Write a structure and sequence with these properties.
Strand content: 15-25%
Structural class: alpha+beta
Number of strands: 29
CATH topology of one domain: Cytochrome Bc1 Complex, Chain A, domain 1
CATH architecture of one domain: 2-Layer Sandwich
Number of helices: 34
Radius of gyration: 31 Å
Length: about 950
Amino acid sequence: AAACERALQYKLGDKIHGFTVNQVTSVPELFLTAVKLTHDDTGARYLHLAREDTNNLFSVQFRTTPMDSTGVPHILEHTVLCGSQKYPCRDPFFKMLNRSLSTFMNAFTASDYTLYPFSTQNPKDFQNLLSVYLDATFFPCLRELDFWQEGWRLEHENPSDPQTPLVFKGVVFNEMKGAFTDNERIFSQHLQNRLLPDHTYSVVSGGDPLCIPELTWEQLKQFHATHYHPSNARFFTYGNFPLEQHLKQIHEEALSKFQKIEPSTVVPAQTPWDKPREFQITCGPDSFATDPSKQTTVSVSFLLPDITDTFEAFTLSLLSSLLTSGPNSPFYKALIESGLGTDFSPDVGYNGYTREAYFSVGLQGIVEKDIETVRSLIDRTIDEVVEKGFEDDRIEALLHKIEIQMKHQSTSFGLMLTSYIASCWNHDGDPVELLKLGNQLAKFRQCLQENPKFLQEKVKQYFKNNQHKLTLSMRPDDKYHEKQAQVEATKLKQKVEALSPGDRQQIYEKGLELRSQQSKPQDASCLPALKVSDIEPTIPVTELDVVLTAGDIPVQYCAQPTNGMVYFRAFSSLNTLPEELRPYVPLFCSVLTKLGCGLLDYREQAQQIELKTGGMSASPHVLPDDSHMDTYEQGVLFSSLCLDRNLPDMMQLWSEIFNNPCFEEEEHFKVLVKMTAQELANGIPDSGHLYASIRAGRTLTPAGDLQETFSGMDQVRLMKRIAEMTDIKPILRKLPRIKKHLLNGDNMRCSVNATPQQMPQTEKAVEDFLRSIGRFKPWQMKTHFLMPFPVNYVGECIRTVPYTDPDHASLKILARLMTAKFLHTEIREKGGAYGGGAKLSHNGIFTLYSYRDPNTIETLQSFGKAVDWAKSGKFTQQDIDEAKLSVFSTVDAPVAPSDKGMDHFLYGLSDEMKQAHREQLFAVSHDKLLAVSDRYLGTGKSTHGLAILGPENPKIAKDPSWIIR
């Protein structure tokens, strides 16, 4: 039933579809089995990580090592995604998201590799996306006109007048123009180029605008045939789907058509310098800065070993973070707090994307006279670090942070694994050694416990005795870009002079054919797509067991491969709370865990939180019932995170928070309240449509009113009013009353997510923790918030049926239909708004929203034409298939193991209820959609709510049906 148990049955030397198993390793601490295969005929490497995670991932990696600054892998990456041999339609990438049930689809271009990852949860969707990716990457139609479109071309300023002079055009060409107006990209690029001047890292891999137009179509085709060949490729697969199907697809679709070649793509070692060097560069003066004489940037860079030696790379990365990350670092206190500059230099810290990594530090925003002062200060700082070493708490905090960031469970775990092994794997390294994190942590801890001067001798060797130092300074000149334009125009004249009139007519006619290609709407019906039969009918059941303990508090344990992590959550009701103290609970939850407990002041408390746990947070939640519009559960969610070994320390911290919260620390409290108020106040536009949908829905259901009090605009205004008061003490007296009504054990329930091997110790620690703690008529309203915004935020809510009603699925499918085919086109293309759609919440509120719309009345008019369109039924059965595909992409969205299962613990939705709602999503038909659109969305048939956040609108101000607050 598990993945790694059957994955351990793969023996070494087994031949599967042309591949040979070379290595199989069980990684019990990571709940996965790694399998290394190579195709005998082609030489392609294959790595399979089998882990019981439904988000299956494929990734393909190509080693592209350019030998000039023409930009061939960036232009080639843009060009291969424009069409393939079996799928000649344009842009499979963008035209394959609407036909798949994918959760992720992108592409990456690093300095020395290109990466094409995708992820999906449906095995037939995996087969389809795997076939389209193999055909797009390995067999693209590489048409010359696409190379003229994406790369570089000569084009008239008006394509219909062939008498105007010719200029250079291209998308990548102007991308690189905009790359080299940026001073930061010039600084980083020149740092990398001067620091590694021997081989491929010395050039501009993205393309320098003056040397890019020397690339021909034939060189691009030859580069694609040599580097986009399976012998120069790395294949990656992750997840629980049967391995045999993937290998059978790879062999029968791609690898059989190729033969073995030998890629001349190995990156040689950087030859070490004997003496440090200095260089001076020039840039363009920026207009956002306020002082022009103080715009010089300087940096100091050191050469580090290769990433191949895993141990030394991990320790030097840790050392570089210890030296540069955070305001407690030596170089921060030496440089930032000196008042010499404004921020760190670009690429500051550890840079591990190249084969040989490099470390960089420096300052920006200094006067040019201070260069030798800065260099001497950095040298003295390195001397002080050699002389004093590091304190033990900072080393423990860093090792605990790296252990958590590697072990913490995200929803896109496979993406973190492929991004974490791509750089090492690109230069023939062993990716499994990066996975055995326990071994490297153990070896580092042993090397510190055995030799107290380990880190000081490392800092000495790589910083004081390292002669491969580069000091690079940059100062702006006001006529830099005009000089660049002059030399580019000179290269332009040099290239245009050689054209014959027949060439000029060929360029003109190709320009007209290119304009037709860029204008003509084309068809994408040749790509495969999923139907309502390839979607799994039932979900795999999630195993739970509820154990009542001490003596009637339910505690839910869910055994999951959480990767050595224990996640504790507790939910305390608000039924006992007096109604006056309700609006102050967001403040309470945001400050409960930040003022200190017992014998620890707030700084030591924060140090303990960062050193023992992964974070402890509290947030209010309003959980509606799924079967009654006027029933909801209100409470506060306590959430925590820790490693397995630090669990009793975390529960002791929770006992001290529950029994002795420090409601007397007022000085730090004023800082915290001003900081949360400023952070919430600056963030109003970015979540404006959320605040509008919460305000509009306050008057429709009790849950909406409670959501407005807990997380609406009323909470922001109240928090700002409290944060502007000079005497906070009468507010501070309200917090012990909240402690006495919330922090008790009468109406509590808890949940625990942990590994199955940890479960009995967790049951003991949790029971000890519980023994250590004490024992409607809707009505319309219109509101306009006068905000100094340049854009608007509109929200309309409609009252519909709850989750368990069979009509809920029809309302949800109709909502997704309306989003995909009416409101998106009408508001976006015509209106011009940046975002716009419709949403249906779990409680039964049908919510309409608009994001950055320049109009107001036109939004309501598009609402009237949209409900008219929805009642008209003018959509085909293919729209129903696309809406079903999108809704199953939304409701079956992946949940991380740290939230599996969260819905049962919070909202009380069983697997039976989800299966019933899934069969209701299956049973929706076109005529039932016509019935429900004619029954609920029509005017006067249901209750509406309106709210608008945005700037002054005079016509709305003269509307008596609007209330201004």
